[PDB]
Write a protein that binds this ligand. Structure first.
Ligand code: HEM
Ligand code: A1BZA
Length: 433
C-alpha cells in the first residue's frame, strides 16, 4: 500500500478541470498523481498560505528552475524555495514596488496603451480579424521591458520576432518537462539569458560613463546580487521578471477581452464609467485608476474564473490531519484558486460572470479567492499588474468596440500558465459607430 492510498481520490479543457471534478467528488483533501494532495478548504488555505512555517516545495518548482539541462528561472524570486534565501532577495526587490515607484510607471503604462489603441483604431473596419491575445501580449511585453529594464522591445512595431519565438518555445519547454524540440527549447533559454547578460552589460556601462539611469526593477535585481560570486543569480531574476512581468498580465488581459465579448451590458457600463471618469483624456493619471471602480470589479471577477497562475504548492513536513484526512509527512500540498473559484460551495452560480460579487457592499471571499496567492509568497507584482491592466483596459473601452469572430472559443489551454485556447480573434469598430 502506497503511503497515500488511504486518501480520497480517483482509482478547451485543462488538468485544472479534472482537479475541480475530483474536488467536488472526493472532497477537500484529494490525492492526485509525483503524488500531491489538493487541499481546497478555506481553513487549509488560511493555515498553510498565511504562515512562514510552510514553504514552497522545491520538487514542484524544478520545471521553472531548469529545463532540459538549461537554467531558466534558477533560484530567482518565484522559484527559490529556501525561506532565508528568498527573504533576502524579496526585501531588496520590494523597494522597486513601493507606491512611489509604481506611480512613476504611469507614463510607460499610458504610452504603450496609447500605442496599442492607435494601432487597433487603424484596423477598426469591422472586417479585419485581429488577434487580441497577440496584441495584448506584445503590449504587455513592451510595457514590462521599458518599465522594469528601460529597454524598448518594440513588439508592437513588429520588432524582436526572434525574442518572441524564444519566449514561445521556452513556455512550451516548461510544459514538456524529441530531437529538434530539445534543440529549439535549449537555444531559446540560452537566448533569453543572453538578452539579460547583454542588457546588464549595457546598464553597467551606462552607470560607469555617468549617464542617467532611472531606478527600476533592474536596479534592485542588481542590488540583491551585490557581492555575489557570479552573475547567475542576477540572470535568474532578469529572466524571472522578463517572463513573469508580462505573461500573466497578457493572459489576464486576453481572458478579460474574450469574456467581455459576450457581456454587452457589462461592456456598456464599463464604457459609461470611463466616459464619466476620464472622458476623452488621452492620459490616465494615477488618481483616475481608483475611480474606475466597476472596472476593478470586472477584473476581479475575470481573475476568479480565469486565474493565469492557478495556484501554488507548499511542502508539508510532518504528518498532519487536514479536514479529517491523515496526510503523511513530506507531501506537496496543491492549492488552486481556479478550482475553488468554480466550486458552488464557495461561489453561488460559479460559472456566472457577475462583477457585483466584488461590489462595495458584498461580503468579501474569505480564503476562497487568491489569483495573486496569499501570504509571504504572494505576487510581488500584484499592484504593478493591476495598474497596467486597468490602463490598457480603460483605453480600449474609451476608444473601441470589439466583436469576437464567430467560431472563436472561450476554452482554456494550460501552458505553464492558463490562457485562452484561441487567439481571441476580433473585429473592431471605433466607439460611436
Ligand atoms: C495579472 C497578473 C499577475 C498574476 C495573476 C500573478 C499571479 C501570481 C501568483 C499566483 C504568484 C504566486 C506564484 C507561486 O506561488 O508559485 C505570483 C508570484 C510572483 N509574481 Fe506574479 N502575477 C501577475 C503579475 C506579475 C507581474 C506584473 C510581475 C512582475 C512585474 C510578477 C512577478 C511575480 C514574482 C516575482 C512572483 C514571486 C514572488 C515571491 O515569491 O516573492 N507577477 N504571481
Ligand atoms: O510555471 C509556474 N509558474 C509561473 C508563474 C508565473 C508568474 C507569476 N507571476 C507572474 O507570472 C509565470 C510563469 C510563466 F513562466 F509561464 F510565464 C509560470 C509554476 C511552476 C511550478 C509550479 C507551479 Cl504552481 C507553477
Amino acid at each position: 500500500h502506497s503511503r497515500y492510498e488511504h486518501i480520497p481520490g480517483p482509482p478547451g479543457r485543462v488538468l485544472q478541470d479534472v482537479f475541480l471534478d475530483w474536488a467536488k467528488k472526493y472532497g477537500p483533501v484529494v490525492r492526485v498523481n509525483k503524488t500531491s494532495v489538493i487541499v481546497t478548504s478555506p481553513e487549509s488555505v488560511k493555515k498553510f498560505l498565511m504562515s512562514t512555517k510552510y514553504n514552497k516545495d522545491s520538487k514542484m518548482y524544478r520545471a521553472l528552475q531548469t529545463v532540459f539541462g538549461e537554467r531558466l528561472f534558477g533560484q530567482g524570486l518565484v522559484s527559490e524555495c529556501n525561506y532565508e534565501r528568498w527573504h533576502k532577495q524579496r526585501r531588496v526587490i520590494d523597494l522597486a514596488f513601493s507606491r512611489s515607484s509604481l506611480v512613476s510607471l504611469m507614463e510607460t503604462f499610458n504610452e504603450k496603451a496609447e500605442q496599442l489603441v492607435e494601432i487597433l483604431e487603424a484596423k477598426a473596419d469591422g472586417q479585419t480579424p485581429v488577434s487580441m491575445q497577440d496584441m495584448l501580449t506584445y503590449t504587455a511585453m513592451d510595457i514590462l521591458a521599458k518599465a522594469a529594464f528601460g529597454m524598448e522591445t518594440s513588439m508592437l512595431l513588429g520588432a524582436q520576432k526572434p525574442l518572441s519565438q524564444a519566449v514561445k518555445l521556452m513556455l512550451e519547454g516548461i510544459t514538456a518537462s524529441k530531437r529538434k524540440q530539445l534543440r529549439e527549447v535549449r537555444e531559446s533559454i540560452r537566448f533569453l539569458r543572453q538578452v539579460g547578460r547583454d542588457w546588464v552589460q549595457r546598464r553597467r556601462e551606462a552607470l560607469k560613463r555617468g549617464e542617467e539611469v532611472p531606478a527600476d526593477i533592474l536596479t534592485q535585481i542588481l542590488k540583491a546580487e551585490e557581492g555575489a560570486q557570479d552573475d547567475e543569480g542576477l540572470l535568474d531574476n532578469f529572466v524571472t521578471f522578463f517572463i513573469a512581468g508580462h505573461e500573466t498580465s497578457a493572459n489576464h488581459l486576453a481572458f478579460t477581452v474574450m469574456e467581455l465579448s459576450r457581456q454587452p451590458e457589462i461592456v456598456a457600463r464599463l464604457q459609461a464609467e470611463v466616459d464619466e471618469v476620464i472622458g476623452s483624456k488621452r492620459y490616465l493619471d494615477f488618481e483616475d485608476l481608483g475611480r474606475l471602480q466597476y472596472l476593478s470589479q470586472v477584473l476581479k471577477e475575470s481573475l476568479r474564473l480565469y486565474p493565469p497562475a492557478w495556484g501554488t504548492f507548499r511542502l508539508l513536513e510532518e504528518e498532519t490531519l487536514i479536514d479529517g484526512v491523515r496526510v503523511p509527512g513530506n507531501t506537496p500540498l496543491l492549492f488552486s484558486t481556479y478550482v475553488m473559484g468554480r466550486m458552488d460551495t464557495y461561489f453561488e452560480d460559479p460559472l456566472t460572470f457577475n462583477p457585483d460579487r466584488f461590489g462595495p457592499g458584498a461580503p468579501k471571499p474569505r480564503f476562497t479567492y487568491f489569483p495573486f496567492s496569499l501570504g509571504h509568497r504572494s505576487c510581488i507584482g500584484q499592484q504593478f499588474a493591476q495598474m497596467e491592466v486597468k490602463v490598457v483596459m480603460a483605453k480600449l473601452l474609451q476608444r473601441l468596440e470589439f466583436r469576437l469572430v464567430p467560431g472563436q472559443r472561450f476554452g482554456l489551454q494550460e501552458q505553464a500558465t492558463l490562457k485562452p485556447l484561441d487567439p481571441v480573434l476580433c473585429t473592431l469598430r471605433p466607439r460611436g459607430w
